[PDB]
Amino acid sequence: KTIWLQGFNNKYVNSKNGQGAMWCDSDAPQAWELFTVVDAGNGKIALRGNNGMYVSSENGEQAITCNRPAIQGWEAFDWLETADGKVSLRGSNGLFISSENGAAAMTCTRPTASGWEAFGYSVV
């Protein structure tokens, strides 16, 4: 299934076509804002961006990216949802992807999920 991800700032997660760090900075979802939800095994998922690569948590040591050709330790996430159907994505470190409210590159550094880590989504 293929989705967009709308952050707390009402902008959309952007793969940046694998060129550097991801940002939640797009006004509307188009090609670079679409991610295919792939089964990563053991009930986890990976997110494949427009460039065919996978989103990586980068161990929470730097901003997340969409440049890996394989699911190799930092690319598997738990899909966790709020009551109204927003999604939070928990990485290998147990930490959540954050939109950072769009004023910084997206990270996977936070151990709890609030607004900045909650994303609206639908299936395309």
Numbering used by the authors: 450 to 573
Please share text taken word for word from the publication where this structure appeared:
To probe the mode of binding of CBM92 domains, we successfully determined the protein structures of the C. pinensis proteins CpCBM92A and CpCBM92B by macromolecular crystallography. As was predicted by sequence analysis, both proteins form a β-trefoil structure comprised of 12 β-strands arranged into 3 subdomains (α, β, and γ), similar to β-trefoil domains found in Fascin and CBM13 proteins. The binding cleft Arg residue in the β-subdomain of CpCBM92B is found in subdomains β and γ in both CpCBM92A and -B, but is substituted with a Ser in the binding clefts of subdomain α in both proteins. This substitution in the α site leads to a substantial increase in accessibility around the glucosyl unit’s O2, which may permit binding to oligo- or polysaccharide extensions from this position. We also see that the α site knockout shows only a small loss of binding ability compared to the wild type, but that there is some residual binding in the β/γ site variant W523A/W565A, suggesting that the wild type α site does make some small contribution to binding in the full protein. The α binding site of CpCBM92A differs from the other two in that it lacks an otherwise well-conserved adjacent Arg that likely supports binding by interacting with a glucose ligand and by creating a topographic ‘wall’ for the binding site. To probe the respective functions of the three putative glycan binding sites, a series of modified constructs were generated for CpCBM92A, systematically altering the Trp in each WExF motif. Variants with single (W481A α site, W523A β site, W565A γ site variants), double (W481A/W565A, W481/W523A, W523A/W565A), and triple (W481A/W523A/W565A) binding site substitutions were produced using site-directed mutagenesis (red stars in Fig. 3 show the positions of the residues modified). Pull-down assays revealed that the single mutation variants showed the same binding specificities as the wild-type, while the double and triple variants showed impaired or abolished binding, confirming that there are no further unrecognised binding sites in the protein. The loss of the Trp residue from either the β or γ binding site (W523A and W565A variants, respectively) caused a major shift in apparent binding ability, with the loss of the β site having the most profound effect. This indicates that for CpCBM92A, the β site likely has the strongest affinity for the ligand.
